[PDB]
Short mmCIF file of C-alpha atoms and ligand atoms in Angstrom, two decimals:
data_model
loop_
_atom_site.label_atom_id
_atom_site.label_comp_id
_atom_site.label_asym_id
_atom_site.label_seq_id
_atom_site.Cartn_x
_atom_site.Cartn_y
_atom_site.Cartn_z
CA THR A 1494 6.74 16.18 -23.89
CA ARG A 1495 9.13 14.89 -21.27
CA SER A 1496 8.24 11.34 -19.65
CA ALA A 1497 7.32 8.13 -20.78
CA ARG A 1498 6.83 4.62 -20.17
CA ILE A 1499 7.10 1.69 -22.64
CA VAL A 1500 4.94 -1.63 -21.80
CA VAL A 1501 5.59 -4.55 -24.36
CA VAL A 1502 2.85 -7.31 -23.61
CA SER A 1503 4.46 -10.64 -24.48
CA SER A 1504 3.71 -13.46 -21.92
CA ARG A 1505 7.21 -15.19 -23.86
CA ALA A 1506 9.46 -12.36 -23.74
CA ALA A 1507 8.60 -11.37 -20.39
CA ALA A 1508 9.45 -14.87 -19.14
CA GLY A 1509 12.99 -14.33 -20.80
CA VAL A 1510 12.27 -16.59 -23.93
CA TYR A 1511 11.43 -14.53 -26.66
CA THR A 1512 13.16 -11.48 -28.37
CA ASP A 1513 11.32 -7.83 -27.70
CA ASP A 1514 11.92 -5.93 -30.71
CA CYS A 1515 9.02 -3.47 -30.55
CA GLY A 1516 10.22 -1.94 -27.42
CA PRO A 1517 13.80 -0.77 -28.35
CA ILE A 1518 11.61 0.77 -31.93
CA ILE A 1519 9.55 2.68 -29.02
CA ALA A 1520 12.51 3.60 -26.89
CA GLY A 1521 14.31 5.17 -30.11
CA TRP A 1522 11.39 6.76 -31.39
CA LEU A 1523 10.49 8.88 -27.85
CA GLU A 1524 14.66 9.71 -27.45
CA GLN A 1525 13.83 11.35 -30.71
CA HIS A 1526 10.96 13.61 -29.54
CA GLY A 1527 12.22 15.24 -26.13
CA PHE A 1528 11.94 12.14 -23.78
CA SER A 1529 14.64 9.48 -22.75
CA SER A 1530 15.65 7.43 -21.93
CA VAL A 1531 12.98 5.21 -21.21
CA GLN A 1532 14.00 1.23 -21.13
CA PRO A 1533 10.94 -1.06 -22.14
CA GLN A 1534 9.00 -3.30 -19.43
CA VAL A 1535 7.82 -6.48 -21.01
CA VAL A 1536 5.10 -8.13 -19.39
CA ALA A 1537 2.45 -11.15 -19.28
CA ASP A 1538 -1.24 -11.02 -21.44
CA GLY A 1539 -3.60 -10.10 -18.63
CA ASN A 1540 -3.34 -8.69 -14.95
CA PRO A 1541 0.40 -8.00 -15.43
CA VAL A 1542 -0.75 -5.24 -18.19
CA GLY A 1543 -3.39 -3.55 -15.96
CA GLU A 1544 -1.14 -3.56 -12.91
CA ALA A 1545 1.69 -2.00 -15.39
CA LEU A 1546 -0.71 0.87 -16.65
CA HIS A 1547 -2.05 1.70 -13.62
CA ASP A 1548 1.23 1.97 -11.96
CA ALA A 1549 2.56 4.31 -14.66
CA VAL A 1550 -0.59 6.28 -14.47
CA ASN A 1551 0.02 6.77 -10.75
CA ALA A 1552 3.18 7.80 -11.27
CA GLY A 1553 2.03 10.83 -13.32
CA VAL A 1554 4.02 10.33 -16.60
CA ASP A 1555 3.08 12.12 -19.30
CA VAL A 1556 3.00 9.10 -22.20
CA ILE A 1557 2.48 5.49 -21.98
CA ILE A 1558 3.17 3.17 -25.11
CA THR A 1559 2.19 -0.14 -24.75
CA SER A 1560 3.09 -2.78 -27.58
CA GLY A 1561 1.05 -6.12 -28.66
CA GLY A 1562 -1.86 -8.21 -27.36
CA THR A 1563 -4.04 -6.06 -29.03
CA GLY A 1564 -5.77 -9.06 -31.92
CA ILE A 1565 -8.29 -11.03 -31.62
CA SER A 1566 -6.68 -14.20 -30.20
CA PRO A 1567 -7.41 -16.09 -26.89
CA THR A 1568 -4.95 -14.45 -25.30
CA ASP A 1569 -5.11 -10.95 -26.48
CA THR A 1570 -6.78 -8.96 -23.53
CA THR A 1571 -4.57 -5.47 -23.90
CA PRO A 1572 -7.47 -3.27 -24.88
CA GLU A 1573 -9.73 -4.19 -21.91
CA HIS A 1574 -7.13 -3.74 -19.71
CA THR A 1575 -6.34 -0.18 -20.86
CA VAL A 1576 -9.98 0.68 -21.52
CA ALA A 1577 -10.12 -0.31 -17.33
CA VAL A 1578 -7.29 2.23 -16.64
CA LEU A 1579 -8.63 4.98 -18.95
CA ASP A 1580 -11.18 7.80 -18.06
CA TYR A 1581 -12.05 7.81 -22.13
CA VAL A 1582 -10.97 6.77 -25.55
CA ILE A 1583 -9.54 9.31 -28.13
CA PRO A 1584 -11.41 6.87 -31.44
CA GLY A 1585 -9.70 9.00 -34.10
CA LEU A 1586 -6.27 8.32 -32.96
CA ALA A 1587 -6.75 4.43 -32.50
CA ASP A 1588 -8.44 4.62 -36.10
CA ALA A 1589 -5.57 6.54 -37.62
CA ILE A 1590 -3.04 3.84 -36.07
CA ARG A 1591 -5.06 1.22 -37.89
CA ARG A 1592 -5.35 2.83 -40.69
CA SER A 1593 -1.49 3.89 -40.62
CA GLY A 1594 -0.28 0.31 -42.09
CA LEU A 1595 -2.90 -0.71 -44.29
CA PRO A 1596 -1.91 -0.04 -47.22
CA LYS A 1597 -0.23 -2.61 -47.32
CA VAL A 1598 -1.12 -5.17 -44.32
CA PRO A 1599 -4.79 -5.61 -44.85
CA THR A 1600 -4.98 -7.33 -41.05
CA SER A 1601 -4.24 -3.74 -39.72
CA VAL A 1602 -8.05 -3.75 -39.34
CA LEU A 1603 -8.11 -6.90 -36.38
CA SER A 1604 -5.78 -4.98 -34.13
CA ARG A 1605 -8.33 -3.91 -31.45
CA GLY A 1606 -6.21 -1.18 -30.06
CA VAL A 1607 -7.33 1.71 -27.96
CA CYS A 1608 -5.59 5.24 -27.28
CA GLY A 1609 -7.24 7.38 -24.40
CA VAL A 1610 -6.21 9.89 -21.47
CA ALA A 1611 -6.03 8.65 -17.77
CA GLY A 1612 -5.92 11.22 -15.52
CA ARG A 1613 -3.24 13.35 -17.10
CA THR A 1614 -1.51 10.48 -18.59
CA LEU A 1615 -2.31 9.58 -22.59
CA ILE A 1616 -1.96 6.07 -23.30
CA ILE A 1617 -1.63 4.60 -26.66
CA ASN A 1618 -1.93 1.12 -27.84
CA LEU A 1619 0.31 0.04 -30.95
CA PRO A 1620 0.50 -3.39 -32.69
CA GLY A 1621 2.89 -6.31 -31.65
CA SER A 1622 4.92 -5.99 -34.67
CA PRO A 1623 8.15 -3.64 -35.69
CA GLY A 1624 6.45 -2.13 -38.78
CA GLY A 1625 3.23 -1.54 -36.88
CA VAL A 1626 4.72 0.05 -34.44
CA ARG A 1627 7.15 2.21 -36.40
CA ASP A 1628 3.85 3.17 -38.94
CA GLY A 1629 1.74 3.89 -35.73
CA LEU A 1630 4.45 5.92 -34.03
CA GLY A 1631 4.71 8.05 -37.31
CA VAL A 1632 0.96 9.01 -36.80
CA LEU A 1633 1.44 9.55 -33.32
CA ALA A 1634 4.60 11.97 -34.33
CA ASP A 1635 1.83 14.22 -35.90
CA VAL A 1636 -0.39 15.20 -32.97
CA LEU A 1637 1.71 14.04 -30.17
CA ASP A 1638 2.93 17.56 -28.94
CA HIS A 1639 -0.94 18.84 -29.59
CA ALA A 1640 -2.44 16.23 -27.65
CA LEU A 1641 0.38 16.62 -24.73
CA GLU A 1642 -0.20 20.41 -24.89
CA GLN A 1643 -4.08 20.11 -24.79
CA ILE A 1644 -4.32 17.35 -21.83
CA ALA A 1645 -1.93 20.05 -20.00
CA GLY A 1646 -4.96 22.75 -20.46
CA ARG B 1143 -13.37 -27.86 -20.69
CA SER B 1144 -12.30 -27.18 -17.27
CA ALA B 1145 -8.73 -26.43 -15.79
CA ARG B 1146 -6.67 -24.91 -12.66
CA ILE B 1147 -2.98 -24.01 -12.93
CA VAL B 1148 -0.97 -24.24 -10.33
CA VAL B 1149 2.23 -22.43 -9.78
CA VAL B 1150 4.71 -23.70 -7.19
CA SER B 1151 7.66 -20.87 -6.13
CA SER B 1152 9.27 -20.88 -2.63
CA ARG B 1153 9.34 -17.09 -3.27
CA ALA B 1154 5.68 -16.99 -2.52
CA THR B 1155 5.99 -12.33 -10.64
CA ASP B 1156 4.79 -15.35 -12.32
CA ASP B 1157 6.60 -16.18 -15.71
CA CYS B 1158 5.26 -19.49 -16.28
CA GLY B 1159 1.80 -19.29 -14.92
CA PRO B 1160 0.60 -17.17 -18.36
CA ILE B 1161 2.26 -19.16 -20.57
CA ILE B 1162 0.20 -21.93 -19.54
CA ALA B 1163 -2.94 -20.23 -19.39
CA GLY B 1164 -1.89 -19.32 -22.69
CA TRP B 1165 -1.82 -22.68 -24.44
CA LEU B 1166 -4.84 -23.70 -22.11
CA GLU B 1167 -6.97 -21.12 -24.21
CA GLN B 1168 -5.58 -22.48 -27.48
CA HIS B 1169 -6.53 -26.09 -26.53
CA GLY B 1170 -10.53 -25.40 -25.68
CA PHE B 1171 -10.33 -24.30 -22.14
CA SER B 1172 -10.51 -21.31 -19.93
CA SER B 1173 -9.30 -18.59 -19.49
CA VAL B 1174 -7.94 -19.55 -16.32
CA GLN B 1175 -6.05 -17.74 -13.63
CA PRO B 1176 -2.92 -19.01 -12.36
CA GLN B 1177 -2.51 -19.77 -9.25
CA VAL B 1178 0.96 -18.83 -7.64
CA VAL B 1179 1.34 -20.72 -4.15
CA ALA B 1180 4.63 -22.46 -1.64
CA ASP B 1181 5.83 -25.23 -1.32
CA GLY B 1182 4.19 -27.52 0.63
CA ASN B 1183 0.61 -27.11 2.07
CA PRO B 1184 -0.61 -24.74 -0.25
CA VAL B 1185 0.08 -27.36 -2.98
CA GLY B 1186 -1.86 -29.68 -1.21
CA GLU B 1187 -4.55 -27.07 -0.91
CA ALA B 1188 -4.82 -26.16 -4.54
CA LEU B 1189 -4.74 -29.69 -5.53
CA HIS B 1190 -7.75 -30.74 -3.19
CA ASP B 1191 -9.42 -27.96 -4.05
CA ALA B 1192 -9.37 -28.43 -7.67
CA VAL B 1193 -10.13 -32.38 -7.65
CA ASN B 1194 -13.07 -31.54 -5.60
CA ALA B 1195 -14.27 -28.82 -8.47
CA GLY B 1196 -14.03 -31.93 -10.53
CA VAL B 1197 -11.72 -30.16 -13.27
CA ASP B 1198 -10.60 -31.76 -16.28
CA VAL B 1199 -7.07 -31.13 -16.04
CA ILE B 1200 -4.68 -29.76 -13.35
CA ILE B 1201 -1.26 -28.38 -14.41
CA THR B 1202 1.34 -27.69 -11.93
CA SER B 1203 4.85 -25.83 -12.36
CA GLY B 1204 7.65 -26.17 -10.07
CA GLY B 1205 8.60 -27.64 -6.83
CA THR B 1206 9.92 -31.10 -9.19
CA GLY B 1207 13.42 -31.24 -8.54
CA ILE B 1208 15.63 -32.42 -5.16
CA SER B 1209 15.92 -28.99 -3.31
CA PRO B 1210 14.97 -29.06 0.25
CA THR B 1211 11.42 -27.94 -0.38
CA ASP B 1212 10.79 -29.57 -3.44
CA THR B 1213 7.84 -31.81 -2.74
CA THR B 1214 4.88 -31.00 -5.61
CA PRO B 1215 5.30 -34.88 -6.44
CA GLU B 1216 4.74 -36.29 -2.93
CA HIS B 1217 1.61 -33.86 -2.84
CA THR B 1218 0.40 -34.83 -6.40
CA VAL B 1219 1.05 -38.60 -5.29
CA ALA B 1220 -0.89 -38.13 -2.39
CA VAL B 1221 -3.92 -36.91 -4.23
CA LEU B 1222 -3.73 -39.20 -7.39
CA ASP B 1223 -5.59 -42.68 -7.72
CA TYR B 1224 -3.09 -43.84 -9.99
CA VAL B 1225 -0.02 -42.25 -12.13
CA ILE B 1226 0.66 -42.40 -15.61
CA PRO B 1227 4.30 -43.28 -15.78
CA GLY B 1228 4.81 -42.95 -19.57
CA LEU B 1229 3.09 -39.17 -19.73
CA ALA B 1230 5.84 -37.83 -16.72
CA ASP B 1231 8.46 -39.82 -18.59
CA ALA B 1232 7.86 -38.35 -22.08
CA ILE B 1233 7.56 -35.03 -20.19
CA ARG B 1234 11.29 -35.40 -18.72
CA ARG B 1235 12.37 -36.62 -22.10
CA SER B 1236 10.57 -33.50 -24.24
CA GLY B 1237 13.09 -30.64 -25.58
CA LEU B 1238 16.72 -31.64 -24.39
CA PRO B 1239 19.10 -30.67 -19.02
CA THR B 1240 19.69 -31.45 -15.13
CA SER B 1241 16.52 -32.67 -14.87
CA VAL B 1242 16.57 -35.69 -15.50
CA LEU B 1243 16.27 -34.61 -12.08
CA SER B 1244 12.34 -33.64 -12.13
CA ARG B 1245 10.63 -36.13 -10.20
CA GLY B 1246 7.18 -35.04 -11.59
CA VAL B 1247 4.36 -37.15 -11.99
CA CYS B 1248 1.12 -37.04 -14.34
CA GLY B 1249 -1.90 -39.42 -12.76
CA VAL B 1250 -5.82 -39.24 -12.36
CA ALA B 1251 -7.54 -38.40 -9.44
CA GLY B 1252 -11.05 -38.94 -9.76
CA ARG B 1253 -12.25 -37.75 -13.40
CA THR B 1254 -9.15 -35.02 -13.15
CA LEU B 1255 -6.27 -35.48 -14.82
CA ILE B 1256 -3.03 -33.80 -13.28
CA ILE B 1257 0.22 -33.30 -15.16
CA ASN B 1258 3.32 -32.20 -13.00
CA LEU B 1259 5.76 -29.90 -15.12
CA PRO B 1260 9.29 -28.34 -14.10
CA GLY B 1261 9.71 -24.74 -13.35
CA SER B 1262 11.17 -23.39 -16.13
CA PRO B 1263 9.48 -21.81 -19.07
CA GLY B 1264 11.62 -24.11 -21.31
CA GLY B 1265 10.42 -27.18 -19.18
CA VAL B 1266 6.91 -25.89 -19.37
CA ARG B 1267 6.75 -25.24 -23.10
CA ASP B 1268 8.46 -28.93 -23.80
CA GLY B 1269 6.10 -30.29 -21.68
CA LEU B 1270 3.09 -28.61 -22.89
CA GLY B 1271 4.63 -30.04 -26.46
CA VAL B 1272 3.85 -33.76 -25.42
CA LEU B 1273 0.80 -32.76 -23.73
CA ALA B 1274 -0.77 -31.62 -26.69
CA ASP B 1275 0.04 -34.85 -28.97
CA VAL B 1276 -1.91 -37.24 -26.27
CA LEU B 1277 -4.59 -34.45 -24.27
CA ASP B 1278 -7.85 -34.90 -26.21
CA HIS B 1279 -7.52 -38.90 -25.99
CA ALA B 1280 -6.18 -38.80 -22.29
CA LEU B 1281 -9.43 -36.56 -21.64
CA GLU B 1282 -11.77 -38.86 -23.84
CA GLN B 1283 -10.58 -42.20 -22.20
CA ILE B 1284 -11.01 -40.77 -18.44
CA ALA B 1285 -14.62 -40.27 -19.43
CA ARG C 991 14.62 3.18 -12.51
CA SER C 992 15.48 0.63 -15.04
CA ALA C 993 17.88 -2.47 -14.91
CA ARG C 994 19.42 -5.41 -17.00
CA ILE C 995 20.38 -8.72 -16.12
CA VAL C 996 22.74 -10.35 -17.56
CA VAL C 997 23.12 -14.29 -16.47
CA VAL C 998 26.12 -15.47 -17.82
CA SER C 999 26.76 -18.84 -18.81
CA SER C 1000 27.51 -20.49 -22.02
CA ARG C 1001 25.27 -23.53 -21.34
CA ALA C 1002 22.13 -21.79 -19.77
CA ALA C 1003 22.87 -19.41 -23.20
CA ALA C 1004 22.61 -22.75 -25.31
CA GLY C 1005 19.75 -24.04 -23.38
CA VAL C 1006 20.98 -26.79 -22.07
CA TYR C 1007 21.15 -25.42 -18.53
CA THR C 1008 18.04 -23.19 -16.91
CA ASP C 1009 18.45 -19.63 -15.71
CA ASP C 1010 17.64 -19.84 -11.95
CA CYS C 1011 19.21 -16.43 -10.87
CA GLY C 1012 18.03 -14.41 -13.36
CA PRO C 1013 14.21 -14.51 -11.98
CA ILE C 1014 15.49 -14.41 -8.78
CA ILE C 1015 17.31 -11.15 -9.39
CA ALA C 1016 14.64 -9.78 -11.65
CA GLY C 1017 11.98 -9.94 -8.21
CA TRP C 1018 14.67 -7.92 -6.22
CA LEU C 1019 14.84 -5.51 -8.89
CA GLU C 1020 10.42 -5.02 -8.91
CA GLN C 1021 10.48 -4.54 -5.00
CA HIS C 1022 13.37 -1.70 -4.97
CA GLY C 1023 10.54 0.21 -7.83
CA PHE C 1024 12.53 -0.69 -10.91
CA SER C 1025 9.63 -1.01 -13.96
CA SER C 1026 12.22 -3.02 -16.25
CA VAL C 1027 13.29 -6.14 -17.06
CA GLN C 1028 13.74 -9.67 -18.85
CA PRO C 1029 17.05 -10.97 -17.95
CA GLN C 1030 19.07 -11.67 -20.48
CA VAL C 1031 21.28 -14.69 -20.97
CA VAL C 1032 24.78 -14.77 -22.49
CA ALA C 1033 27.62 -17.30 -22.94
CA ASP C 1034 31.02 -16.53 -21.12
CA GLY C 1035 33.86 -14.44 -22.81
CA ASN C 1036 32.96 -12.06 -25.74
CA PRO C 1037 29.23 -11.77 -25.39
CA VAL C 1038 29.32 -10.44 -21.88
CA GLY C 1039 31.26 -7.41 -23.37
CA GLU C 1040 28.44 -6.92 -26.19
CA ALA C 1041 25.88 -7.28 -23.68
CA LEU C 1042 27.21 -4.76 -21.21
CA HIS C 1043 28.06 -2.18 -24.19
CA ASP C 1044 24.25 -2.58 -25.81
CA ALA C 1045 23.04 -1.83 -22.23
CA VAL C 1046 25.30 1.40 -21.44
CA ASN C 1047 24.32 2.79 -24.64
CA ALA C 1048 21.04 2.27 -24.06
CA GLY C 1049 21.60 4.20 -20.70
CA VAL C 1050 20.07 1.60 -18.21
CA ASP C 1051 20.20 2.80 -14.53
CA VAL C 1052 21.84 -0.49 -13.47
CA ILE C 1053 23.02 -3.93 -14.95
CA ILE C 1054 23.25 -6.91 -12.16
CA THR C 1055 25.61 -9.54 -13.88
CA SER C 1056 25.52 -13.38 -12.71
CA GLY C 1057 28.17 -15.68 -13.31
CA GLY C 1058 31.57 -15.90 -14.73
CA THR C 1059 33.35 -14.38 -12.07
CA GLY C 1060 35.42 -17.72 -10.67
CA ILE C 1061 39.25 -18.88 -11.81
CA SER C 1062 38.14 -21.52 -14.07
CA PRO C 1063 39.70 -21.42 -17.73
CA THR C 1064 35.69 -19.67 -18.90
CA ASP C 1065 35.75 -17.37 -16.11
CA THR C 1066 36.15 -13.85 -17.98
CA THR C 1067 32.99 -11.79 -16.55
CA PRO C 1068 35.66 -9.57 -14.79
CA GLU C 1069 37.62 -8.79 -17.39
CA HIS C 1070 34.77 -8.01 -20.11
CA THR C 1071 33.17 -5.58 -17.01
CA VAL C 1072 36.90 -3.63 -16.76
CA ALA C 1073 36.82 -3.43 -20.21
CA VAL C 1074 33.56 -1.34 -20.35
CA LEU C 1075 33.75 0.24 -16.48
CA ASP C 1076 35.23 3.84 -16.56
CA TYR C 1077 36.24 3.05 -12.60
CA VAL C 1078 35.66 0.09 -10.15
CA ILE C 1079 33.99 0.54 -6.49
CA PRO C 1080 36.30 -1.89 -4.54
CA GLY C 1081 34.11 -1.78 -1.41
CA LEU C 1082 30.97 -2.76 -2.92
CA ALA C 1083 32.76 -6.10 -4.65
CA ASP C 1084 34.60 -6.69 -1.31
CA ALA C 1085 31.07 -6.37 0.64
CA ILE C 1086 29.61 -8.72 -1.68
CA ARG C 1087 32.15 -11.40 -1.35
CA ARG C 1088 31.92 -11.02 2.32
CA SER C 1089 28.15 -11.65 2.06
CA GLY C 1090 28.95 -15.43 1.83
CA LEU C 1091 30.87 -15.66 4.71
CA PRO C 1092 31.53 -17.77 7.33
CA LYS C 1093 29.26 -20.27 5.78
CA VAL C 1094 30.89 -20.56 2.04
CA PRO C 1095 34.47 -19.55 2.50
CA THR C 1096 34.97 -20.20 -1.06
CA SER C 1097 33.31 -16.70 -2.05
CA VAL C 1098 36.59 -15.10 -1.49
CA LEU C 1099 37.67 -16.85 -5.10
CA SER C 1100 34.73 -14.50 -7.08
CA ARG C 1101 36.88 -11.92 -8.67
CA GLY C 1102 33.82 -10.02 -9.30
CA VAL C 1103 33.94 -6.19 -9.71
CA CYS C 1104 31.49 -3.17 -9.59
CA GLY C 1105 31.62 0.42 -11.12
CA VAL C 1106 30.14 2.82 -13.05
CA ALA C 1107 30.35 2.77 -17.16
CA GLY C 1108 29.03 6.20 -17.66
CA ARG C 1109 25.98 6.80 -16.09
CA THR C 1110 25.70 2.97 -15.47
CA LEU C 1111 26.00 1.24 -12.27
CA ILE C 1112 27.22 -2.06 -13.00
CA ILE C 1113 27.74 -5.15 -10.51
CA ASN C 1114 29.10 -8.42 -10.71
CA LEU C 1115 27.41 -11.84 -9.04
CA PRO C 1116 28.52 -14.75 -8.53
CA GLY C 1117 26.51 -17.58 -10.55
CA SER C 1118 25.20 -19.63 -7.62
CA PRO C 1119 21.80 -18.49 -6.63
CA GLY C 1120 23.04 -18.60 -2.82
CA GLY C 1121 25.97 -15.91 -4.00
CA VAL C 1122 23.37 -14.03 -5.56
CA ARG C 1123 20.48 -14.17 -2.87
CA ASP C 1124 23.83 -13.18 -0.32
CA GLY C 1125 24.83 -9.89 -3.04
CA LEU C 1126 21.57 -8.62 -3.02
CA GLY C 1127 21.70 -8.69 0.81
CA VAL C 1128 24.51 -5.75 0.21
CA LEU C 1129 22.52 -3.90 -2.46
CA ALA C 1130 19.39 -3.57 0.00
CA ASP C 1131 20.83 -0.29 1.65
CA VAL C 1132 23.58 0.80 -0.34
CA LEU C 1133 21.70 0.82 -3.86
CA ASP C 1134 19.42 3.93 -3.94
CA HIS C 1135 22.39 5.89 -2.68
CA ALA C 1136 24.29 4.79 -5.29
CA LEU C 1137 22.03 5.84 -7.97
CA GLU C 1138 21.45 9.01 -6.62
CA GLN C 1139 25.24 9.90 -5.70
CA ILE C 1140 25.88 8.86 -9.79
CA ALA C 1141 23.14 11.14 -10.96
CL1 CL D 2596 -1.10 -6.40 -31.10
#
């Protein structure tokens, strides 16, 4: 637990014509867990996602947290770009993040987020909504320290 | 349906291209990758290639004002068979901005519809909102 | 590194004008190894103070503002900036003013300041895309060292 990036995926927000409410949530939670102070990078759907992830992995960050672009809309390609960068996926973590918001938000099941490892960087896809983000960070909090420990040895 | 997106930037990140690409997917196109190009010859090249390819629609963004390098409308008129003045006017009248100054045109080149949009995300938004109400009919009439 | 851009214009904030300077500043930051930002766009006056305080609290490495540094009644960017700053960096402000000369002798009328608030570097740029490009030229060979000195 020490270094991280945040990538918020929204073409409108990235163009500066829309609010990013998810990024600040992630930044605050990271501050509570031994990182600090990370500022959101807001990028458009598509190639800019690949570009941000490769850049962050090649920086050797411990953790990348993404928000948005995981649904089933024409333009949601975050999972594809993430899988491309990943060495492998962590299915149980992605499933638990989906189930976290479920009670509750039944459409949770439509988020196609993955999590995985690339090099020694842990990557987490979260949904593009403030509640889905907070619920998924709650899931991550139960396992982050262990996950980072394991990746390091 | 087929399309190309030409983002005209003197700088040549593209903020408008992905917005237009997303709109087009909503309207039955694509996955279209925006081509970001400099003013001038590169605008010509992107238009000519798209017209040759026989795409249904070309959307451009930027280079429509009165700065020394703003020649998107000139390059557009150069490839058009004819202009559709009401559509350019409707795009200018959407949204309201200094732009009254956008000299964008719209028109048909062959069986390809070309639409000039301003180089701002808000101008693009407003423009696309106009297009949303006429695009199906326009493509039908051209065919 | 992280940055915020605060474009200061009531008309741009209102959607009445387009923000052309914000995107110019954003692209320059990316070439200098910044991950970051959307600009922000805020009205003249108190919103400026709001935006700087939010950005200083969040702990960003740099804030670049654009506009509101002139001598018209609604130009209050320098005021709100000095209110947030712990201290000014006079030589950087001066260097930014001079970057417009000799071509735009009215460049000397910008009352823009630079300084540090906490661990955040703040730089006032003028509201014209030419004053902005001219100011980024100054920053090119001092910004990395500035940030290193602050840290
Ligand atoms: Cl999502």
